[PDB]
């Protein structure tokens, strides 16, 4: 399973972001929204291969969360798809980058903007994110960004859609990569 | 599902999906209830799950 897989929780579908580990143990990141309240994690909608079990989440303010590998057979690639990611870098403004998600897809654009407050309202507000011209839609939350061979962000929501054009922010990976002591692989 | 607080300007993007009178399959509350008010009150819910 790689970035941009379909990840499955009790309550809904997700993908996965990156892999990466700490160590010998195996990880998984995703979005925060999908982490709060969920606990285990499958592979497809018939929950039947099981892939492990919720270890953090932070959502709202950020939006990461990071799930431990239960299953011992499972592969679990360092890849986008099959695009190779070997390193973690900070977005800039004007940075070509694609996203991966379950839903739509592999689709590109550029970063718009650093630092942005999303409110998705009711007190679920998330600072510090990455605006782009990415489109995005359900089913893609927690999917890697990446340009390149360098892991960049998690998707996270935004407006609009893949048909006429939309704005996606992401979190940076940076900061749940520092927040769990992981790194990508 | 209750769409007053809407319209929001963003949604997050996890899947699980509502049916519209329209039959289309909204990905999620946030996406069905910005619809709902984009088209001015006429759509309303079909059922939950995928249409």
């Known amino acids: ?185 | 599902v209750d769409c007053s607080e809407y319209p929001k300007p963003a949604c997050t993007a996890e899947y699980r999906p509502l049916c519209g009178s329209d039959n289309k399959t909204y990905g999620n509350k946030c996406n069905f209830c910005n619809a709902v008010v984009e088209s001015n009150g006429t759509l309303t819910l079909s059922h939950f799950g995928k249409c």
């Open chain 1, 1 to 185: 399973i790689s970035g941009g897989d379909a990840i499955y929780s009790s309550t809904g579908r997700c993908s996965l972001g990156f892999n990466v580990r700490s160590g010998s143990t195996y990880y998984f990141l995703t979005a925060g929204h999908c982490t709060d309240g969920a606990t285990t994690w499958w592979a497809n909608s018939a929950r039947t291969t099981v892939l492990g079990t919720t270890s953090g989440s932070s959502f709202p303010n950020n939006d990461y969360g990071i799930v431990r590998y239960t299953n011992t057979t499972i592969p679990k690639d360092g890849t986008v798809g099959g695009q190779d990611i070997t390193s973690a870098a900070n977005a800039t403004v004007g940075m070509a980058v694609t996203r991966r998600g379950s839903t739509t897809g592999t689709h590109s654009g550029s970063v718009t903007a650093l630092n942005a407050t999303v409110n998705y309202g009711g007190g679920d507000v998330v600072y510090g994110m990455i605006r782009t011209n990415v489109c995005a839609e359900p089913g893609d939350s927690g999917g890697p960004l990446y340009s390149g061979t360098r892991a960049i962000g998690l998707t996270s929501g935004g407006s609009g859609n893949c048909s006429s054009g939309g704005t996606t922010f992401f979190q940076p990976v940076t900061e749940a990569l520092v927040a769990y002591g992981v790194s990508v692989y």
